[PDB]
Structure 1
């Protein structure tokens, strides 16, 4: 079911590709198009091969050459596109912790929507690159239940999908109801333990049951019961439980629907997901927002920045 929008180019020729990129830079100006048409048509693993082959042919660093020939939001995308898949999430996480004021949005998005396999892969890569323990770093930069929930999630420990138990589903649905709507204040720990540790397949069933017994969708209750930090995280986790593609589709929409563009988010989501579920993301986006992902990117962005994004994205006809 899970489909990306960028795949390996067949008949890929690492050296030819380098020569092309060289031809697009060496001399007066810069052939943005040629760089943009090639790199959005090669997978992450293949860009790495292009970057290594470029060095052997020209004794120059591809990425740095492009940094010195490109500009603005376009350069940012290309640079993000060039970052090894393995290191990308950890890179965005590191920059989100760096400096006194943390970037919660990024922590929540990534940690709430990455599968256990992925999260433990991120943790190892992050410790390899930076010599810091990710969990420890997150603990240092967050606080309260938001910190607690993140720590729980970072254990990469969630129950595995298993035989579905009707008794457990009713029990857990009731616990959430008793912990939220029925209680003066909120049993934050119950929400956290349940929404943090229970399996995906199990929780989807618990949601349907929660609605049946409470009249509320769990998302309404989370909004009615919590605020800021914690609300966003629990909302993020819940939506990811339902559908990571649908969660990330909503993430893109909200990055574009206002007066500006949250370009930092536009870029991260498109790039990181281009080889996993961006096709799924596009389907869900259309499904929930009346237009294609394409048309909204077209409306919010300009120039080569726009051109690359659209080629990366695809689906003009969604």
Structure 2
């Protein structure tokens, strides 16, 4: 296959025996990590929830608690992320990004620029239920000025939906972005915020093309020269997710691994969250952009059982 996810529903699914295999893998000194991977990375997220249920009822134990106790470090993080329902995983990642003194702005941007409208609503509902604060409120206490405004707009949605295309308004929006940045002293960043957070995807694709026609620059090139900081990063992520969301994630993956070190938090979250959606597309775009396979990047930059499970999520 060449598009869609890498992890699919397993055939012959037997949740009671999967639970047995996982218990045997952990019981006693030592762990059979290959069995844990060979079951869980070959079940989709829905099926992993059925295994959690069957493990409680037939093992009389808590599968997430046992996995947490038995596994450590990056391997634990991937397996626990894989075990978590989609909405709650995003909720937990947003909370972790804001918990305590720091802020993981890159995570906030990645999730809030890339999730679809219904996903965003579910995240808001579950975050508030779980923590007793709204996501918007936590974003406002962790961010300021224009960056706060873009993230709050992304949480509120309200972007025009659907695809109707008014050629005259496309032209005026492109002219207005040109006049708000490149053509003027300073940048009217509210105009950037307004157009990029309010227009529907189809309109914006047409605005980007027109912007290039009238300025000789890609809109990303003008966002980079005209804005800075986390606000710039947020605008770029919105543009990239509009143009080609799999290539946005391919870039996140490349930047998490290229050069010194690995940003494991980002590598893990992207691999877990996109495995069932568009990982095949992400792979194809990664190879197009970087002329190396995603598989070979993971293989070359990680090790151990962590590596083995990421390579299966990659396919």
Q: TM-score, normalised on structure 2?
A: 0.97
Per-residue deviation, 1:86: 2.1
Per-residue deviation, 1:2: 6.2
Q: Write out per-residue CA displacement over residues 49-104 of structure 1, whole angstroms, 9 at most, x where no aligned residue.
A: 11121111122111111222222211111111111112111110011111122111
Q: Which residue is 1:124 aligned to? A: 125
Per-residue deviation, 1:168: 1.1
Q: Which residue is 1:172 aligned to? A: 173
User: Structure 2: how far apart are the matches of 1:134 and 1:239?
Assistant: 23
Per-residue deviation, 1:28: 2.9
Q: Secondary structure in 1 aligned to 2:182?
A: coil
Per-residue deviation, 1:188: 0.2
Q: Which residue is 1:46 aligned to? A: 47
Q: Is the 8 A contact 1:223 1:231 kept in 2?
A: yes
Per-residue deviation, 1:6: 0.7
Task: Give the direction of change, closer, same or farther, for the CA distance of 1:40–1:259 in structure 2 (3 Å limit).
Answer: same
Q: Secondary structure in 1 aligned to 2:42?
A: coil
The answer as to 2:164 corresponding to 1:163 is yes
Q: Secondary structure in 2 aligned to 1:93?
A: helix
Q: Is the 8 A contact 1:245 1:278 kept in 2?
A: yes
User: Structure 2: how far apart are the matches of 1:161 and 1:203?
Assistant: 12
Q: Which residue is 2:192 aligned to? A: 191
Alignment of 1:29-108 (within 5 A): 29-108=30-109
Query: Unpaired segments of 5 or more residues in structure 1?
Result: none
Q: Is the 8 A contact 2:164 2:202 kept in 1?
A: no
Aligned-pair RMSD on alpha carbons? 1.2
User: Structure 2: how far apart are the matches of 1:120 and 1:153?
Assistant: 10
Per-residue deviation, 1:162: 2.5
User: Structure 1: how far apart are the matches of 2:95 and 2:196?
Assistant: 25
Q: Write out per-residue CA displacement over residues 190-236 of structure 1, whole angstroms, 9 at most, x where no aligned residue.
A: 00000111010100011011001100100010110111111111111
User: Structure 2: how far apart are the matches of 1:25 and 1:100?
Assistant: 36
Q: Which residue is 1:13 aligned to? A: 14
User: Structure 2: how far apart are the matches of 1:101 and 1:307?
Assistant: 31
Q: Secondary structure in 2 aligned to 1:24?
A: helix
Q: Which residue is 2:259 aligned to? A: 258
Q: Number of matched residues?
A: 314
Task: Give the direction of change, closer, same or farther, for the CA distance of 1:2–1:161 in structure 2 (3 Å limit).
Answer: farther
User: Structure 2: how far apart are the matches of 1:203 and 1:238?
Assistant: 8
Q: Is the 8 A contact 1:4 1:279 kept in 2?
A: yes
Q: Is the 8 A contact 1:2 1:276 kept in 2?
A: no
Q: Is the 8 A contact 2:19 2:59 kept in 1?
A: no
Moved more, 258-267 or 21-30: 21-30
Q: Secondary structure in 2 aligned to 1:221?
A: helix
Moved more, 172-181 or 113-122: 113-122
Q: Is the 8 A contact 2:196 2:238 kept in 1?
A: yes
Q: Which residue is 1:151 aligned to? A: 152
User: Structure 2: how far apart are the matches of 1:88 and 1:75?
Assistant: 14
Runs of 4+ in 1 over 6 A off after TM superposition: none
User: Structure 2: how far apart are the matches of 1:46 and 1:239?
Assistant: 32
Q: Which residue is 2:282 aligned to? A: 281
Q: Which residue is 2:134 aligned to? A: 133
User: Structure 1: how far apart are the matches of 2:87 and 2:218?
Assistant: 36
User: Structure 2: how far apart are the matches of 1:74 and 1:63?
Assistant: 14
